[PDB]
Design a protein around this motif. Structure first.
Motif, PDB file in Angstrom:
ATOM      1  N   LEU A 201       0.849  -1.176   0.000  1.00 27.87           N
ATOM      2  CA  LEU A 201       0.000   0.000   0.000  1.00 27.87           C
ATOM      3  C   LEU A 201       0.897   1.242   0.000  1.00 27.87           C
ATOM      4  O   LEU A 201       0.706   2.157  -0.797  1.00 27.87           O
ATOM      5  CB  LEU A 201      -0.894  -0.021   1.235  1.00 27.87           C
ATOM      6  CG  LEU A 201      -1.970   1.057   1.345  1.00 27.87           C
ATOM      7  CD1 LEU A 201      -2.792   1.110   0.065  1.00 27.87           C
ATOM      8  CD2 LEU A 201      -2.859   0.750   2.549  1.00 27.87           C
ATOM      9  N   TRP A 202       1.888   1.268   0.882  1.00 25.23           N
ATOM     10  CA  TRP A 202       2.800   2.404   0.940  1.00 25.23           C
ATOM     11  C   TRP A 202       3.408   2.639  -0.440  1.00 25.23           C
ATOM     12  O   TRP A 202       3.856   3.745  -0.759  1.00 25.23           O
ATOM     13  CB  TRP A 202       3.923   2.153   1.956  1.00 25.23           C
ATOM     14  CG  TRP A 202       4.976   3.251   2.005  1.00 25.23           C
ATOM     15  CD1 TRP A 202       6.331   3.083   1.987  1.00 25.23           C
ATOM     16  CD2 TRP A 202       4.752   4.672   2.064  1.00 25.23           C
ATOM     17  NE1 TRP A 202       6.970   4.306   2.028  1.00 25.23           N
ATOM     18  CE2 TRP A 202       6.026   5.297   2.076  1.00 25.23           C
ATOM     19  CE3 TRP A 202       3.602   5.478   2.106  1.00 25.23           C
ATOM     20  CZ2 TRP A 202       6.182   6.692   2.129  1.00 25.23           C
ATOM     21  CZ3 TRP A 202       3.758   6.871   2.159  1.00 25.23           C
ATOM     22  CH2 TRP A 202       5.042   7.459   2.169  1.00 25.23           C
ATOM     23  N   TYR A 203       3.430   1.597  -1.262  1.00 23.98           N
ATOM     24  CA  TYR A 203       3.997   1.732  -2.595  1.00 23.98           C
ATOM     25  C   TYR A 203       3.053   2.451  -3.546  1.00 23.98           C
ATOM     26  O   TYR A 203       3.447   3.406  -4.203  1.00 23.98           O
ATOM     27  CB  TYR A 203       4.333   0.372  -3.188  1.00 23.98           C
ATOM     28  CG  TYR A 203       4.769   0.462  -4.630  1.00 23.98           C
ATOM     29  CD1 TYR A 203       6.074   0.823  -4.963  1.00 23.98           C
ATOM     30  CD2 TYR A 203       3.863   0.216  -5.666  1.00 23.98           C
ATOM     31  CE1 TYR A 203       6.470   0.934  -6.289  1.00 23.98           C
ATOM     32  CE2 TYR A 203       4.244   0.329  -6.998  1.00 23.98           C
ATOM     33  CZ  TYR A 203       5.550   0.688  -7.303  1.00 23.98           C
ATOM     34  OH  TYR A 203       5.934   0.795  -8.625  1.00 23.98           O
ATOM     35  N   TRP A 204       1.811   1.988  -3.621  1.00 19.76           N
ATOM     36  CA  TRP A 204       0.849   2.605  -4.514  1.00 19.76           C
ATOM     37  C   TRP A 204       0.427   4.003  -4.089  1.00 19.76           C
ATOM     38  O   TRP A 204       0.058   4.821  -4.931  1.00 19.76           O
ATOM     39  CB  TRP A 204      -0.359   1.688  -4.702  1.00 19.76           C
ATOM     40  CG  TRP A 204       0.039   0.467  -5.473  1.00 19.76           C
ATOM     41  CD1 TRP A 204       0.167  -0.811  -4.996  1.00 19.76           C
ATOM     42  CD2 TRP A 204       0.489   0.432  -6.831  1.00 19.76           C
ATOM     43  NE1 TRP A 204       0.673  -1.632  -5.971  1.00 19.76           N
ATOM     44  CE2 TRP A 204       0.880  -0.895  -7.108  1.00 19.76           C
ATOM     45  CE3 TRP A 204       0.601   1.394  -7.841  1.00 19.76           C
ATOM     46  CZ2 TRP A 204       1.379  -1.284  -8.357  1.00 19.76           C
ATOM     47  CZ3 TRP A 204       1.096   1.009  -9.080  1.00 19.76           C
ATOM     48  CH2 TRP A 204       1.478  -0.320  -9.326  1.00 19.76           C
ATOM     49  N   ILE A 205       0.489   4.284  -2.792  1.00 19.52           N
ATOM     50  CA  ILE A 205       0.146   5.610  -2.307  1.00 19.52           C
ATOM     51  C   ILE A 205       1.161   6.577  -2.919  1.00 19.52           C
ATOM     52  O   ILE A 205       0.784   7.593  -3.506  1.00 19.52           O
ATOM     53  CB  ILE A 205       0.234   5.689  -0.772  1.00 19.52           C
ATOM     54  CG1 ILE A 205      -1.029   5.097  -0.147  1.00 19.52           C
ATOM     55  CG2 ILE A 205       0.429   7.118  -0.342  1.00 19.52           C
ATOM     56  CD1 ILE A 205      -0.961   4.975   1.364  1.00 19.52           C
ATOM     57  N   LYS A 206       2.445   6.244  -2.775  1.00 23.16           N
ATOM     58  CA  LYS A 206       3.533   7.056  -3.312  1.00 23.16           C
ATOM     59  C   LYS A 206       3.411   7.187  -4.823  1.00 23.16           C
ATOM     60  O   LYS A 206       3.508   8.275  -5.381  1.00 23.16           O
ATOM     61  CB  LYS A 206       4.890   6.419  -2.985  1.00 23.16           C
ATOM     62  CG  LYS A 206       5.276   6.459  -1.517  1.00 23.16           C
ATOM     63  CD  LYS A 206       6.748   6.084  -1.298  1.00 23.16           C
ATOM     64  CE  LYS A 206       6.964   4.575  -1.289  1.00 23.16           C
ATOM     65  NZ  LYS A 206       8.396   4.209  -1.055  1.00 23.16           N
ATOM     66  N   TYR A 207       3.214   6.044  -5.464  1.00 27.53           N
ATOM     67  CA  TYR A 207       3.080   5.924  -6.901  1.00 27.53           C
ATOM     68  C   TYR A 207       1.950   6.785  -7.441  1.00 27.53           C
ATOM     69  O   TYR A 207       2.140   7.556  -8.377  1.00 27.53           O
ATOM     70  CB  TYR A 207       2.810   4.457  -7.260  1.00 27.53           C
ATOM     71  CG  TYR A 207       2.883   4.141  -8.738  1.00 27.53           C
ATOM     72  CD1 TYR A 207       4.036   3.579  -9.293  1.00 27.53           C
ATOM     73  CD2 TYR A 207       1.807   4.414  -9.588  1.00 27.53           C
ATOM     74  CE1 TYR A 207       4.121   3.296 -10.656  1.00 27.53           C
ATOM     75  CE2 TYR A 207       1.879   4.137 -10.960  1.00 27.53           C
ATOM     76  CZ  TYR A 207       3.041   3.581 -11.486  1.00 27.53           C
ATOM     77  OH  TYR A 207       3.136   3.335 -12.835  1.00 27.53           O
ATOM     78  N   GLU A 208       0.769   6.643  -6.859  1.00 30.03           N
ATOM     79  CA  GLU A 208      -0.385   7.389  -7.325  1.00 30.03           C
ATOM     80  C   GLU A 208      -0.320   8.878  -7.039  1.00 30.03           C
ATOM     81  O   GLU A 208      -0.743   9.686  -7.877  1.00 30.03           O
ATOM     82  CB  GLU A 208      -1.669   6.805  -6.731  1.00 30.03           C
ATOM     83  CG  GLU A 208      -1.982   5.407  -7.224  1.00 30.03           C
ATOM     84  CD  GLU A 208      -2.240   5.359  -8.720  1.00 30.03           C
ATOM     85  OE1 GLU A 208      -3.400   5.553  -9.140  1.00 30.03           O
ATOM     86  OE2 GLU A 208      -1.277   5.133  -9.480  1.00 30.03           O
ATOM     87  N   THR A 209       0.201   9.254  -5.869  1.00 27.24           N
ATOM     88  CA  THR A 209       0.279  10.668  -5.540  1.00 27.24           C
ATOM     89  C   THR A 209       1.293  11.346  -6.419  1.00 27.24           C
ATOM     90  O   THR A 209       1.107  12.505  -6.804  1.00 27.24           O
ATOM     91  CB  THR A 209       0.651  10.929  -4.060  1.00 27.24           C
ATOM     92  OG1 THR A 209       1.829  10.195  -3.720  1.00 27.24           O
ATOM     93  CG2 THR A 209      -0.492  10.540  -3.150  1.00 27.24           C
ATOM     94  N   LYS A 210       2.361  10.627  -6.752  1.00 31.49           N
ATOM     95  CA  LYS A 210       3.395  11.207  -7.598  1.00 31.49           C
ATOM     96  C   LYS A 210       2.900  11.332  -9.037  1.00 31.49           C
ATOM     97  O   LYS A 210       3.124  12.351  -9.699  1.00 31.49           O
ATOM     98  CB  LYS A 210       4.678  10.375  -7.561  1.00 31.49           C
ATOM     99  CG  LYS A 210       5.818  11.059  -8.304  1.00 31.49           C
ATOM    100  CD  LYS A 210       7.140  10.338  -8.144  1.00 31.49           C
ATOM    101  CE  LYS A 210       8.255  11.148  -8.779  1.00 31.49           C
ATOM    102  NZ  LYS A 210       9.602  10.554  -8.577  1.00 31.49           N
ATOM    103  N   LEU A 211       2.227  10.294  -9.519  1.00 30.74           N
ATOM    104  CA  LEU A 211       1.698  10.316 -10.877  1.00 30.74           C
ATOM    105  C   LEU A 211       0.672  11.439 -11.005  1.00 30.74           C
ATOM    106  O   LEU A 211       0.675  12.176 -11.991  1.00 30.74           O
ATOM    107  CB  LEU A 211       1.051   8.972 -11.222  1.00 30.74           C
ATOM    108  CG  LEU A 211       0.442   8.849 -12.622  1.00 30.74           C
ATOM    109  CD1 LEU A 211       1.496   9.098 -13.682  1.00 30.74           C
ATOM    110  CD2 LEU A 211      -0.148   7.468 -12.778  1.00 30.74           C
ATOM    111  N   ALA A 212      -0.204  11.569 -10.011  1.00 27.61           N
ATOM    112  CA  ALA A 212      -1.218  12.623 -10.031  1.00 27.61           C
ATOM    113  C   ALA A 212      -0.574  14.010 -10.080  1.00 27.61           C
ATOM    114  O   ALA A 212      -0.957  14.867 -10.876  1.00 27.61           O
ATOM    115  CB  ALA A 212      -2.100  12.523  -8.802  1.00 27.61           C
ATOM    116  N   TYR A 213       0.402  14.222  -9.209  1.00 30.43           N
ATOM    117  CA  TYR A 213       1.103  15.488  -9.120  1.00 30.43           C
ATOM    118  C   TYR A 213       1.829  15.795 -10.430  1.00 30.43           C
ATOM    119  O   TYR A 213       1.874  16.952 -10.876  1.00 30.43           O
ATOM    120  CB  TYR A 213       2.089  15.419  -7.953  1.00 30.43           C
ATOM    121  CG  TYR A 213       3.030  16.595  -7.827  1.00 30.43           C
ATOM    122  CD1 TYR A 213       2.558  17.869  -7.501  1.00 30.43           C
ATOM    123  CD2 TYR A 213       4.400  16.432  -8.028  1.00 30.43           C
ATOM    124  CE1 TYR A 213       3.428  18.954  -7.378  1.00 30.43           C
ATOM    125  CE2 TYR A 213       5.279  17.507  -7.906  1.00 30.43           C
ATOM    126  CZ  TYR A 213       4.788  18.768  -7.582  1.00 30.43           C
ATOM    127  OH  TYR A 213       5.666  19.831  -7.471  1.00 30.43           O
TER     128      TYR A 213
END
Length: 282
Positions: A201-213
């Motif tokens: 989860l800590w992975y996709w949170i980082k992944y998704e927030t970065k992609l969104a940004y």
């Protein structure tokens, strides 16, 4: 607008307004055109002020201004976009606030549903108090301790939607999108997640927030798409490197997920979108 968009908007806001002098602020419509926001009168009374920073923490954005003369007289504009609030450099539909700077430089804040809020404050201790009401920034903080999710006997959805418990910034589409990648049923309690799922989860949170940004726009923020494509991006979560060049909703507001699987518009503690076919309680 969620965490990532607010941060990118702040970036653009500093780019054009940091160092500029705010001459006047006017609420020409909406929830404030009737009765201005808290501290509004005391605010335009101390104007002009210089903008020294435009920062965010999660979904909370704030302007930091200082009196040219008395630099100990610091002022702040608290602001939350809500469901439809967006900033822009041209007067757009549903413009609610109009900010005037020196040299006729304008900045606008539109908000069709009027869920956004404003508040002007002259206290720095009141700011720290506010910022302390939010958990670490899920996008700017590259070392949050997602592990404490185990200690909570409540739905993983609620735990991510919460702005203080684990971290701040996640909203309706990020949580839905993130959980879909981790393949975790939103109903799964934080106390039932395995160390595996946790670090996953800590992975996709980082992944998704970065992609969104890193995306030009998400849906809203389209009012800043030209500025957005002309401004760089800070290296938040410098090791996770999303593959897609733009953020695409896989499950959010999607009848069927990519592979066809049905996506339920469930509504547990608005509507959370997930694909039972891929997200498991395991």
């Amino acid at each position: 607008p969620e965490g990532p968009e607010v941060a990118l908007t702040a970036d653009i806001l500093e780019k054009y307004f940091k160092g500029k002098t705010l001459e006047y602020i006017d609420f020409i419509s909406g929830r404030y055109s009737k009765s201005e926001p808290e501290g509004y009168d005391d605010f335009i009374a101390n104007l002009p002020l210089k903008v020294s920073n435009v920062d965010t923490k999660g979904k909370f954005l704030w302007f930091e201004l200082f009196d040219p003369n008395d630099k100990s007289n610091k002022w702040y504009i608290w602001n939350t976009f809500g469901l439809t609030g967006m900033w822009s450099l041209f007067e757009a539909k549903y413009t609610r606030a109009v900010l005037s700077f020196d040299n006729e430089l304008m900045a606008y804040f539109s908000d069709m549903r009027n869920f956004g809020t404003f508040k002007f404050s002259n206290s720095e201790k009141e700011l720290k108090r506010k910022l302390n009401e939010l958990g670490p920034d899920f996008l700017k903080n590259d070392d949050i301790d997602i592990s404490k999710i185990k200690k909570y006997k409540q739905p993983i959805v609620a735990l991510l939607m919460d702005q203080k418990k684990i971290g701040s910034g996640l909203g309706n589409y990020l949580v839905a999108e993130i959980l879909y990648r981790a393949k975790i049923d939103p109903h799964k309690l934080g106390s039932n997640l395995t160390d595996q799922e946790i670090e996953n989860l800590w992975y996709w949170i980082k992944y998704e927030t970065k992609l969104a940004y890193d995306s030009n726009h998400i849906g809203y923020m389209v009012n800043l798409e030209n500025e957005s494509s002309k401004i760089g991006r800070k290296n938040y979560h410098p090791n996770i490197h999303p593959t897609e060049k733009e953020f695409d909703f896989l499950v959010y507001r999607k009848k069927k997920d990519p592979n066809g699987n049905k996506v339920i518009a469930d509504k547990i503690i608005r509507t959370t979108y997930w694909a039972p076919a891929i997200q498991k309680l395991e």
